[PDB]
Design an enzyme around this catalytic site. Structure first.
Site, PDB file in Angstrom:
ATOM      1  N   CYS B 105      84.630 -29.125  63.149  1.00 10.62           N
ATOM      2  CA  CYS B 105      83.578 -29.875  62.413  1.00 10.62           C
ATOM      3  C   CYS B 105      84.232 -30.931  61.552  1.00 10.62           C
ATOM      4  O   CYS B 105      84.754 -31.896  62.145  1.00 10.62           O
ATOM      5  CB  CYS B 105      82.628 -28.920  61.693  1.00 10.62           C
ATOM      6  N   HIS B 125      82.825 -33.080  64.149  1.00 15.02           N
ATOM      7  CA  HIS B 125      81.406 -33.326  64.030  1.00 15.02           C
ATOM      8  C   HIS B 125      81.168 -34.805  64.189  1.00 15.02           C
ATOM      9  O   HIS B 125      81.982 -35.632  63.688  1.00 15.02           O
ATOM     10  CB  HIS B 125      80.906 -32.896  62.631  1.00 15.02           C
TER      11      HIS B 125
END
Lengths: 187, 187
Positions: B105, B125
Site C-alpha cells: 500500500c 496503492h
C-alpha cells in the site's frame, strides 16, 4: 447522527475477522466500539495478535443500543461468545428491538447457542456448518455473505471485506458502501 | 527449522495490512515477530485499532536475521517507517544479505526513503504511486502483487491476502501457500 456498531471481542477470536470489520465500518463513518468480553484488558486472538479493546462489554452495553452487533469468528472466540450470559442478553435485546446482528465464520454458532434468529437462512465457515445446523434450526447457504432480514452471516477470513461492506450497506446504503469499497483495491 | 518474519508496526499503520499478513504467515508455520517501532507499548493504528506488539524493534533486531521484513501500509505508518534510522539499518542489512523485503500500500514508500531496491518493478496503492515514483527509481506496476526478485510489493487492504500468500510462497513454497489458502474462503 451517525450509526453505531458493537464488535464483541473474546479470547481466541479470529483477528482478521475482527479488524477487517472494525476498520471498514469506521471507514463508513459508523462509530464502532470494540468491546472485550472478559473485561477491559488486551485480548489474545487466535493467531496471537493482541488487541486492546475500547471498553469492556459491561461498559459498552451501558452505552447502547447499537445499530449492529458484530460477532467475529475463530472457533475458540465463538465458543466463548456462545458460553456468555452477557452475550445472550445483548443478542436477545438486539433481536427484540429489531436491530441487525452480523456474524462471520464460526461466529454464527453463537446465534445457535443463544437461540437467536431461528428460521433464518445463514452461512458459516464450511467447518462450522455441522455445529450450526444441529437441530435444523436454520437453513444453510453457501453464499459468501447471506442476509435474511436482520441476520447477516458470512463464511471466513476471505469473505470479511464482503461481510463488512454488507454491514455498511445495510446501515448506510449502497452508495456509501461503494465509496468505501473503491479505495480498498478489492478484486 | 522454521523461517521467521519481522513485521514492523508503527503508529498509523493500516491495521488490516498488519493483521492479515501476521495471521496468514503464522498459519504457514512461519514464526512472526510483531515489532513496535516506538518501543514495546501498544500501537494505535490508522482506524484506531490498538495492537500490542510482541517486542520492541530494538529487541527484535537482536534476534534476527529474518527471512522476510514486512512493512504494512497506512500513510502515517509508512511515514514513520520512512523517518526511522532503525528501519533504514534493518532494511539495508536485509538487502545486503539478500533477504526478502515485502511492503504493501503506502509501505513501499519507505523503500524509497531508505534507498532500498532501486531498479525493481514495484506496485503501491494508486494514491501512493506519485510519491513512490519521485525520481524514477523504480518501474511501476499495476499488478495486485509484484515481485522482482527480493522486493515484493502489493497495493491495498484488498490485496493483503494475496500479498501474505505471496510471502508464504516465497519462503515455504507454492504447496504450503495453497494449503494455507483453502481454509480462508478467498474467492
Amino acid at each position: 447522527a451517525s450509526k453505531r456498531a458493537l464488535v464483541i471481542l473474546a479470547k481466541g477470536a479470529e483477528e482478521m475477522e475482527t479488524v477487517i470489520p472494525v476498520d471498514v465500518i469506521r471507514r463508513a463513518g459508523i462509530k464502532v466500539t470494540v468491546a472485550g468480553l472478559a473485561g477491559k484488558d488486551p485480548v489474545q486472538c487466535s493467531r496471537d495478535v493482541v488487541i486492546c479493546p475500547d471498553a469492556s462489554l459491561e461498559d459498552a452495553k451501558k452505552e447502547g443500543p447499537y445499530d449492529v452487533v458484530v460477532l467475529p469468528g475463530g472457533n475458540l472466540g465463538a465458543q466463548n461468545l456462545s458460553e456468555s450470559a452477557a452475550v445472550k442478553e445483548i443478542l436477545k435485546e438486539q433481536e427484540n428491538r429489531k436491530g441487525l446482528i452480523a456474524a462471520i465464520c464460526a461466529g454464527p454458532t453463537a446465534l445457535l447457542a443463544h437461540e437467536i434468529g431461528f428460521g433464518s437462512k445463514v452461512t458459516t465457515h464450511p467447518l462450522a456448518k455441522d455445529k450450526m445446523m444441529n437441530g435444523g434450526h436454520y437453513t444453510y447457504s453457501e453464499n459468501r455473505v447471506e442476509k435474511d432480514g436482520l441476520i447477516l452471516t458470512s463464511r471466513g477470513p476471505g469473505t470479511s471485506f464482503e461481510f463488512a461492506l454488507a454491514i455498511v450497506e445495510a446501515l448506510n446504503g449502497k452508495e456509501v458502501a461503494a465509496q468505501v469499497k473503491a479505495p480498498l483495491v478489492l478484486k
